Design a protein around this ligand. Structure first.
Ligand SMILES: [Cl-]
Ligand SMILES: [Mg+2]
Ligand SMILES: [Mg+2]
Lengths: 196, 4, 243, 204, 241, 250, 231, 195, 222, 244
């Protein structure tokens, strides 16, 4: 699994592969590892698919019920609910989640929640098995207040390398753009990203 | 038991 | 009849007489007020000095919830404390799960649903307090007043206790004379005056004034008590107006 | 310490022309030690027949449990339970103990009183239903019984012919298993008469 | 006569506590009205703010239960908010469990079943409220479903609730006798809101300012309430016709 | 807090009457007339749809409910009490039967389970009885067609034909004259409409009348094909159109 | 009248008669006086006997090394509330290595008494308490009433003819408040205060009960020949 | 615990039970009676885990004695065995099962027949002409297969039992310090003092 | 086991093999692994046979009650959500691997559920021991905008790949076609390409071959 | 609180009677008469259906006579719904005993346990008692044929012939007049019907208003058969005795 969230000028962008593997066999080659917990709060799921799906479902319910009573929740509030589930059930969960949302006050925010259930607010995050190979690349190449096209290229080139070296990562590169404009889904096919 |  | 002997029983009118009886206990209590201002709220209360033996400044009636909400009440003082204890649990569990401190409207309903719950069963007594509370959140200042029935609304000014009609009349004048808004430091001085004017309906025993305030500029959005120079300044303002 | 192969034993059921046959060995042992040569593994609740192999304490417990349940069924329904319905009851009852199961291999056999159709069914230990036209096998010599039944069996056998086929299937299977044999019983079931025969087999 | 104190049968087979809960409905002295367009469902309610110290933005008997479902209450605000919070919790749980948004009529039935329990169980009193649920259901289209303390609920072509409910009801009845259809044959929700206000003015015989009314509108995939300026824009349209 | 009512609200009076059951029956008497007629090859259950308001959509309110594919129920008395009984009746058919035997319960046994629920409201702590009488029509392979009445007490009786509620006395006298043991299902529907016209005062058409049958299997209503044994539900609710057709030849 | 059956019922004028009847049990109880300076806090309690053969009901209970109360009314209820205070004082010590503030002690009693006045089945506490203590903010005196109302005072008295001692302390307020670094003189003022609540009976050796806490004085009770000094 | 035998003959049931109670490398007792009378015409011998054996035996004894008082009636040996089996059948799926194996020798007064039931700790009940528990069976069953006849007298049954004890004393590794023998018949339960 | 699901333009089709096995032995030569959750929601099961039947029967029941309560035809996402919440609760101890497919007011749907409570979405899916043999065929021949008759052919071809090449799969091909605006048609034994050849010999024994000790009439009546 | 509305169902009158038991018996006295007559070679259970309607389905009906197991039956007088709760409990208690001891439950043990349940409702729980009287007709290998009755008090007694429900005073006088110990089943059948025929509040006793059952050893050799009479069988037995 290869997932990452990058915060840029107009908001945040979520990026992931589409490969789910049982052992060395690919169960699904078109997985959607980017999931909606609220209209402009999305997360990236890594680890046990069963565990990350179950968690994501609970939070969406929590933020829906939050919205009914207190209106739109902050990205921090969403990350806090994710953390609460991940931390309190750390013994029974294998889930590395990157929470990314767009407020109008706070703009683009990225919170990473590793296995422990700790919360880390970052300018960009990378997680999953494939991430290891692109720590060097992402650190050298990331800049703050990038444009949409720069951030899309940064994520595309990063996940392209992650996919190239990681057996557990492959297929298409899905991306989700969170800005004041709204929500935009992007897809990139092997024939494009492989020969970057 | 049985499997399928 | 006998419709008034049990809580949660509808009279043929469609009324819960036990809640109306709890209101009489509130009407009997000392005067407490709330004044919404530009960037916060101001709370004030009448403390009847029963005896010389009462230690001044050491029978505090205004209570803080979390770090940003202030609560004051008239009627059965213990019932008020029970409601604030609940409010503090509600505010703690909200912060625990959602990280952010509880918004005032969110907090208001947490008390509202709890007080309303004590009108649903004959095994519990309604609350013998009207609670004036509020503070500063992400959306700005909010003042609320909550009644034994579980009924609460947002207020520009709120008053409850024996001198409520006197205080309300004085509050209505401020709302009319200051449409653009009242400043935090002004509201503290007005709060003092209104308690002194509302003391005319409770004038056998002389009293002790107690004021608190949340203000985005003055207290940095946190609840603080008005003490020392600022308190004496407000008392002197009120003393000048009655004469 | 494999619960299904401590006591040992086998059950086999077959369908014929307007008839069913269910047969079982009589051995109850404690591993190598043969203890009882009278332990019957076939019971009946009205016209519905149940054979149970596996751990003998569970064979006894389930018989008592299904007698209990079919008795209350009859009092409330004011009629005898049918094989298809009883099969479902067995499945429900076994799966109720999914994470602490009865170590058994039950086999339902009987003729539906309304439709007159021959019916047989087998279950796994967790209660999965195995419905069959031809035959059901269960026990420590299930491999042997599968080999015997699959070669010997043919459809629409008359009650008297079906008796010979099921008997030779059980006997020759039981003689190739250490924990099975020590005597055998065969039930021949017609619409409104049932014949029960004890077979002569080698006692080793 | 303790058969009038708790929810048990009187000799003549009546539940007096249910009947008295109905009388509590009109304690606010507010009249609500709901009508269906082609694409929308509009609910309007009177807004009376007698105290000058009240913050008029916080005075509301219309609730946003889910994204799609809206609810107006005729009855005291404590019971109204009790019902609102439960309905929100029920609608959220439904979506989590069954993987699709709770329909208007299903929530109405669920809240009606809860109301029924209070009429049969002694320790719980009925809520002194009539709940009018409105949405644009993805299967049934524009929907109005109303609940009462008895635990009764039914779908409506249109409905009215409050002290002068009968006058509004007969006013709407006479219109649907004339129009010969089950709804307001209108494209935009803006004009369905104008119809709702116009027919309330005729029935009650009173004029409304922007602060005298409260409007909720259900469209496909969202329910929303109108601000004072949204209503004022609407009142100006009616006046200029 | 908590339910402190752990004692019976239904007790014996000196005369030996159970007040709350008698008063529940009084509530059923006030209720709108519903009836059931059993034919040789089916059962019919019918009732008037008393509209609370002409603005109300009486289609949304279903007085006649499917419990199983082969069992239906109608009532007289308090509609809310009926609605929760139908919910409980549907669930108990699964939990206490279908999840055990892999088939739907026979009419008499489901009736028995509904009766048990209504009996418990008569004796359990801090509850009043149900203010409804149910007419449950159903078919099963071994009993054939059957019709049952269930009273607030939890008592149930099997009927050839009967009526309950407002004009039950007059309706029962009418059915006695018309009922024979050779009635075909169409003849029973005809009598059901004649009997119901006497009690109904206002409009009498397919929109004010709710009528369902327990008849032949409906493969078209099953929703799938391929399993020969599964032949579809015997319960069918007559449409507003299907009623009006029979009201012309009345 | 019709509204005094239980604590869960309000009267038409908004009264809780069961709480008022519990308050009445205190008035019937024997007089006890509380008063403090800035350095010390003193309890003086008139103990009551059944007859000349009986012992004198012990009025004063120790809660911690720095806190304790006197009682007037139902003694078993005082035992329940004092035991609860001992636990709360003890919890503060073990968990936070912190002596419980006398003000928090009052808040905890208030909230415990309140819960009994709002729930069906229960009853109000039938006892009044005078809590004295020395914490990080000096000497303190509290008056607990079973309504839940807790009040911090310089001096007070509760029980039968307590108005006599309460009037005296109200007059003497300016004198006894400044008895700093002198235990014996603060006690004398407390013994003179309780004397104003006496009718026909006078203070004897096994009749008088005195307790004191202060800056360099743990909460210690004086009975028998130890109080003979002050008669 | 170790050796418990049972032989049903024409008119009686005979239970032999070893007297040795061994723990470690020490025979603590050589006169232990591994049996309880459940009712006047029903006897139960037991062998297995230390503590469990007696605790189980006495628990059953109490229940059968309670039934006898309540109904003023003696439960049939078949009825008692069925009750005991169900208790062990419950036990095996408990948190800590009774590791007790029993023989129930009884005389049914209604049928006028002796009955011997062999029940293991799993709750595996069988009616037998002769039964044994533990390693004893490996010697006695083949011996009884040969020498046993169904119409034998009580005296013939005791001689057949002596033949079993002699074979066990010859070929068994452990010293079980002889057996206590008891006879269940129409006249109730009595102990053979010289064996 | 070999179960596949294929989506076509106006519906979804699920197919499965008919072989049930204990260890290396074939317990059931012709067992139906296609289950009815609701009239228009069908499910194919692999893993523990008992678990798949039980979980399908339980949700099938709760969906019927939900359908009656809401007066609405059940949705595939409801069956999916109820399944995956139940399976997740038991942390994979219920060994049910399902392909859920059906039509509802929302449209046509195809999902896969794993024992641990994970779910997949796809136009073509394959579960069981023969999934790799089946998925090979699906990956080779699947395309967008399949017709009904093409989807049935592809689905049955994918099952056949399992039947021949996987030892766990064999016997026949069951198919269920769920098309929008039509009744779902359950094609049991759609293909029977593994018919047992005529035996060389009849093993019908001469009557009296078996030695008998006792006979008796059994009483089944009251 | 809730104390106000508590009937206190489980208290004593000043006289030392249980109000709710006395009022439950007054309730049963208006229920259709049920008669049990015990002969030397079987037991008869007869019961009069409560004022029948001509459109009541008579053949597929069970109001009065219920089967507990293959050897025991009961006749009911009072609330049918209340009786069915107790019958299902009795049916389970019988199967629990069989499962435990592999022997059919003795009649008295089943009767005592059902009576002990009724007793519980009079002493604790604050619930109304079961408005039901039973006539237990059963056989076991200890006491043979046995008649019992239980009532809401939870008190049970054994009988040779007994009535419960309406006109027990009149019914018990007529049974006490014509009963004798050496009576046969066929004679007991006639007595049962003749008693109901005279004590009935109806104009004339007919087949459609009667439930009838016999527990004979009339099966084949040393085994008991329960016979719940069909409508046509009651019509025949009513003509045979010459009542119609
Ligand atoms: Cl519900
Ligand atoms: Mg051998
Ligand atoms: Mg054994």
């Amino acid at each position: 699994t290869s997932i990452m969230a990058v915060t840029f000028k107009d908001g945040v962008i979520l990026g992931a592969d589409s490969r789910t593997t049982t052992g060395a066999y690919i169960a699904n080659r078109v997985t959607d590892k980017l999931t909606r917990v609220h209209d402009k709060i999305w997360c990236c799921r890594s680890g046990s698919a069963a565990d990350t799906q179950a968690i994501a479902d609970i939070v969406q319910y929590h933020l829906e019920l939050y919205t009914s009573q207190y209106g739109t929740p902050s990205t921090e509030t969403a990350a806090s609910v994710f953390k609460e589930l991940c931390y309190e059930n750390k013994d029974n969960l294998t889930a590395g989640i990157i929470v990314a949302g767009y407020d109008d006050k706070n703009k683009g925010e990225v919170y990473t929640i590793p296995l422990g259930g700790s919360v880390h607010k970052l300018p960009y995050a990378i997680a999953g098995s494939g991430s290891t190979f692109i720590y060097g690349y992402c650190d050298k190449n990331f800049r703050e207040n990038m444009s949409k096209e720069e951030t899309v290229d940064f994520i595309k080139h990063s996940l392209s390398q992650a996919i190239k070296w990681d057996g557990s990562s492959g297929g298409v590169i899905r991306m989700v753009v969170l800005t004041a404009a709204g929500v935009e889904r992007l897809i990139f096919y092997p024939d494009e990203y492989e020969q970057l | 038991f049985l499997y399928x | 009849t006998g419709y008034d002997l049990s809580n949660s029983v509808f009279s043929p009118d469609g009324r819960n007489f036990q809640v109306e009886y709890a209101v009489k206990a509130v009407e009997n209590g000392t005067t407490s007020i709330g004044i919404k201002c530009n960037d916060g709220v101001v709370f004030a209360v009448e403390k009847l000095i029963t005896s010389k033996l009462l230690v001044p400044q050491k029978n505090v009636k205004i209570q803080v919830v979390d770090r940003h909400i202030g609560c004051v009440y008239s009627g059965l003082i213990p019932d008020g404390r029970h409601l604030v204890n609940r409010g503090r649990e509600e505010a703690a569990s909200f912060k625990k799960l959602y990280k952010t401190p509880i918004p005032i409207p969110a907090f208001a309903d947490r008390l509202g649903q709890y007080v309303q719950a004590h009108t649903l069963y004959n095994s519990v007594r309604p609350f013998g307090v009207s609670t004036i509370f509020g503070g500063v959140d992400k959306n700005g200042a909010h003042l609320y007043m909550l009644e034994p029935s579980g009924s609460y609304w947002g207020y520009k000014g709120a008053a409850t206790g024996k001198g409520r009609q006197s205080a309300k009349a004085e509050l209505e004048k401020l709302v009319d004379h200051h449409p653009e808004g009242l400043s935090a430091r002004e509201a503290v001085k007005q709060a003092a005056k209104i308690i002194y004017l509302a003391h005319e309906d409770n004038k056998e025993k002389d009293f002790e004034l107690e004021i608190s305030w949340c203000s985005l500029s003055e207290t940095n959005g946190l609840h603080k008590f008005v003490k020392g120079d600022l308190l004496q300044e407000a008392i002197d303002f009120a003393q000048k107006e009655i004469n | 310490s494999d619960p299904s192969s401590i006591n040992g034993g086998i059950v086999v059921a077959m369908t014929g022309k307007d008839c069913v046959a269910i047969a079982c060995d009589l051995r109850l042992g404690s591993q190598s030690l043969g203890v009882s040569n009278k332990f019957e593994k076939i019971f009946h609740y009205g016209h519905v027949f149940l054979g149970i192999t596996g751990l003998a304490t569970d064979v006894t417990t389930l018989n008592e449990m299904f007698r209990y349940k079919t008795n209350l069924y009859k009092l409330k329904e004011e009629r005898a339970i049918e094989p298809e319905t009883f099969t479902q009851l067995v499945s429900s009852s076994l799966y109720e103990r999914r994470f602490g199961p009865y170590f058994v291999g039950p086999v339902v056999a009987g003729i539906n009183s309304k439709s007159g159709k021959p019916f047989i069914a087998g279950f796994d230990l967790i209660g999965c239903i195995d419905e069959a036209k031809d035959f059901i096998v269960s026990g420590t010599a299930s491999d042997q019984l599968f080999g015997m039944c699959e070669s010997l069996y043919e459809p629409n056998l008359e009650p008297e012919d079906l008796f010979e086929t099921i008997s030779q299937a059980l006997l020759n299977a039981a003689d190739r298993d250490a924990l099975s044999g020590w005597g055998a019983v065969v039930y021949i079931i017609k619409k409104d008469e049932v014949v029960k025969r004890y077979l002569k087999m080698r006692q080793d | 006569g303790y058969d009038r104190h708790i929810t048990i049968f009187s000799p003549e087979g009546r539940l007096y506590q249910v009947e008295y809960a109905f009388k509590a409905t009109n304690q606010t002295n507010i009249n609500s009205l709901a009508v269906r367009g082609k694409d929308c469902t509009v609910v309007i309610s009177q807004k009376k703010v007698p105290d000058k110290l009240l913050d008029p933005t916080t005075v509301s008997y219309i609730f946003c239960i889910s994204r799609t479902i809206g609810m107006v209450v005729n009855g005291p605000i404590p019971d109204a908010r009790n019902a609102a919070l439960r309905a929100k919790a029920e609608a959220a749980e439904f979506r989590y469990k069954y993987g699709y948004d709770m329909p208007c009529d299903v929530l109405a039935k669920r809240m009606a079943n809860l109301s029924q329990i209070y009429t049969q169980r002694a320790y719980m009193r009925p809520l002194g409220v009539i709940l009018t649920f409105v949405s644009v259901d993805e299967e049934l289209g524009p929907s109005i479903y109303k609940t009462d303390p008895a635990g009764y609920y039914v779908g409506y072509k249109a409905t009215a609730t409050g002290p002068k409910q009968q006058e509004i009801t007969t006013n709407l009845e006479n219109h649907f006798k004339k129009s010969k259809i089950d709804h307001i044959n209108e494209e935009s929700w803006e004009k369905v809101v104008e119809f709702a206000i116009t027919h309330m003015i005729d029935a009650l015989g009173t004029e409304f300012s922007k602060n005298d009314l409260e409007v909720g509108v259900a469209t496909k995939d969202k329910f929303f309430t109108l601000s004072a300026e949204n209503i004022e824009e609407r009142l100006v349209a009616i006046a200029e016709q | 807090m908590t339910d402190r009512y752990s004692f019976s609200l239904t007790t014996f009076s000196p005369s030996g009457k159970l007040g709350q059951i008698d008063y529940a029956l009084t509530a059923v008497k006030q209720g709108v007339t519903s009836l059931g007629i059993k034919a040789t090859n089916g059962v019919v259950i019918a009732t008037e749809k008393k509209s609370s308001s002409p603005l109300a959509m009486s289609e949304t309110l279903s007085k006649v409910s499917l419990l199983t594919p082969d069992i239906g129920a109608v009532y007289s008395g308090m509609g809310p009490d009926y609605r929760v009984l139908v919910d409980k009746s549907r669930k108990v058919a699964h939990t206490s039967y279908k999840r055990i035997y892999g088939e739907y319960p026979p009419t008499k046994l489901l009736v028995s389970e509904v009766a048990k629920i209504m009996q418990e409201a008569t004796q359990s702590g801090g509850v009043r009885p149900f203010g409804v009488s149910l007419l449950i029509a159903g078919h099963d392979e071994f009993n054939g067609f059957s019709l049952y009445q269930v009273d607030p007490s939890g008592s149930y009786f099997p009927w050839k034909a009967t009526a309950i509620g407002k004009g039950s006395v007059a309706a029962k006298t009418f059915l006695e004259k018309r009922w024979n043991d050779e009635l075909e299902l169409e003849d029973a529907i005809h009598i059901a409409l004649l009997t119901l016209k006497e009690s109904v005062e206002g409009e009498f058409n397919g929109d004010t009348i709710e009528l369902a049958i327990i008849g032949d299997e409906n493969p078209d209503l099953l929703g799938y094909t391929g399993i020969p044994t599964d032949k579809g539900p015997r319960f069918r609710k007559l449409t507003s159109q299907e009623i009006n057709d029979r009201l012309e030849a009345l | 009248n019709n509204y005094d059956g239980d604590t869960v019922t309000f009267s038409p004028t908004g009264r809780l008669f069961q709480v008022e009847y519990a308050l009445e049990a205190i008035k019937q109880g024997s007089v006890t006086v509380g008063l403090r300076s800035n350095t010390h806090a003193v309890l003086v309690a008139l103990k009551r006997n059944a007859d000349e053969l009986s012992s004198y009901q012990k009025k004063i209970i120790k809660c911690d090394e720095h806190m304790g109360l006197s009682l007037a009314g139902l003694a078993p209820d005082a035992r329940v509330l004092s035991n609860y205070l001992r636990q709360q004082c003890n919890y503060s010590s073990l968990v936070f290595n912190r002596k419980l503030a006398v003000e928090r002690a009052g808040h905890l009693l208030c909230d415990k008494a309140q819960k009994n006045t709002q729930s069906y089945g229960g009853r109000p506490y039938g006892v009044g308490l005078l809590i004295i203590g020395y914490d990080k903010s000096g000497a303190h005196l509290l008056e607990f009433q079973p309504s839940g109302n807790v009040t911090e005072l310089y001096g007070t008295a509760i029980g039968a003819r307590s108005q006599g001692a309460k009037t005296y302390l109200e007059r003497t307020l300016d004198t006894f408040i400044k008895i700093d670094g002198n235990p014996d003189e603060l006690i004398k003022a407390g013994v003179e205060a309780i004397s104003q609540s006496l009718r026909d009976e006078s203070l004897t050796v096994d009749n008088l009960s005195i307790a004191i806490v202060g800056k360099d004085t743990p909460f210690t009770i004086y009975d028998g020949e130890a109080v003979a000094k002050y008669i | 615990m170790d050796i418990i035998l049972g032989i049903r003959v024409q008119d009686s049931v005979i239970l032999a039970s070893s007297k040795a109670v061994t723990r470690g490398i020490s025979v603590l007792k050589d006169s232990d009676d591994k049996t309880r009378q459940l009712s006047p015409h029903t006897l139960m011998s037991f062998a297995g885990e230390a503590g469990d054996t007696v605790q189980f035996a006495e628990y059953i004894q109490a229940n059968i004695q309670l039934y006898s008082i309540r109904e003023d009636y003696e439960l049939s040996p078949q009825a008692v065995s069925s009750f005991v089996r169900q208790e062990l059948a419950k036990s095996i799926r408990s948190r800590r099962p009774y590791q007790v194996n029993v023989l129930i020798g009884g005389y049914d007064k209604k049928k006028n027949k002796p009955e011997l039931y062999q029940i293991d700790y799993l709750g595996t009940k069988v009616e037998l002409p002769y039964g044994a528990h533990g390693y004893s069976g490996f010697y006695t069953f083949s011996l009884l297969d040969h020498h046993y006849r169904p119409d034998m007298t009580t005296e013939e049954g005791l001689d057949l039992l002596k033949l079993c004890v002699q074979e066990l004393e010859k070929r068994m590794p452990m010293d079980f310090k002889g057996v206590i023998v008891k006879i269940v018949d129409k006249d109730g339960i009595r102990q053979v003092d010289d064996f | 086991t070999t179960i596949v699901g294929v989506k076509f333009n106006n519906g979804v089709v699920i197919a499965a093999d008919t072989r049930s096995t204990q260890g290396p032995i074939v317990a059931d030569k012709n067992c139906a692994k296609l289950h009815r959750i609701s009239p228009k929601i069908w499910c194919a099961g692999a893993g523990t046979a008992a678990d798949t039947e039980a979980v399908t029967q339980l949700i099938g029941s709760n969906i019927e009650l939900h359908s009656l309560y809401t007066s609405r035809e059940p949705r595939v996402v409801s069956a999916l959500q109820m399944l995956k919440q139940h399976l997740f609760k038991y942390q994979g101890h219920i060994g049910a691997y399902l392909i859920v497919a059906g039509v509802d007011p929302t449209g046509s749907h195809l999902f896969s559920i794993h024992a641990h409570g994970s779910t997949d979405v796809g136009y073509y899916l394959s579960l069981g021991s023969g999934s790799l043999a089946a998925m090979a065929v699906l990956e080779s021949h699947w395309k967008q905008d399949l017709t009904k008759e093409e989807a049935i052919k592809l689905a049955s071809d994918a099952i056949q790949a399992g039947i021949w090449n996987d030892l766990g799969s064999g016997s026949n091909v069951d198919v269920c076609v769920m098309e929008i605006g039509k009744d779902a048609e359950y094609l049991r034994n759609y293909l029977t390409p593994n018919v047992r050849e005529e035996k060389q010999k009849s093993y019908k024994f001469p009557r009296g071959t078996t030695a008998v000790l006792k006979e008796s009439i059994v009483n089944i009546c009251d | 609180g809730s104390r106000r509305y508590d009937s206190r169902t489980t208290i004593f009158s000043p006289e030392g009677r249980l109000y709710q038991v006395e009022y439950a018996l007054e309730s049963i006295s208006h229920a259709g008469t049920a008669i049990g007559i015990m002969a030397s070679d079987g037991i008869v259970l007869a019961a009069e259906r409560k004022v029948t309607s001509t459109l009541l389905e008579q053949d597929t009906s069970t109001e009065k006579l219920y089967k507990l197991n293959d050897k025991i039956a009961v006749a009911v007088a009072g609330l049918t719904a209340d009786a069915e709760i107790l019958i299902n409990t009795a049916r389970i208690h019988a199967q629990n005993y069989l499962k435990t001891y592999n022997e059919d439950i003795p009649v008295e043990i089943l009767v005592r346990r059902l009576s002990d349940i009724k007793q519980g409702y009079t002493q604790h729980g604050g619930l109304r008692p079961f408005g039901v009287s039973f006539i237990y007709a059963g056989y076991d290998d200890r006491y043979g044929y046995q008649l019992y009755t239980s009532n809401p008090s939870g008190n049970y007694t054994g009988w040779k012939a007994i009535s419960v429900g309406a006109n027990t005073s009149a019914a018990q006088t007529l049974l006490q007049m014509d009963y004798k110990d050496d009576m046969k089943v066929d004679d007991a059948i006639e007595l049962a019907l003749k008693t109901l025929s005279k004590t009935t509040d109806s104009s004339a006793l007919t087949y459609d208003r009667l439930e009838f059952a016999t527990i004979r050893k009339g099966a084949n050799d040393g085994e008991v058969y329960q016979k719940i009479f069909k409508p046509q069988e009651i019509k025949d037995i009513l003509v045979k005795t010459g009542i119609t």
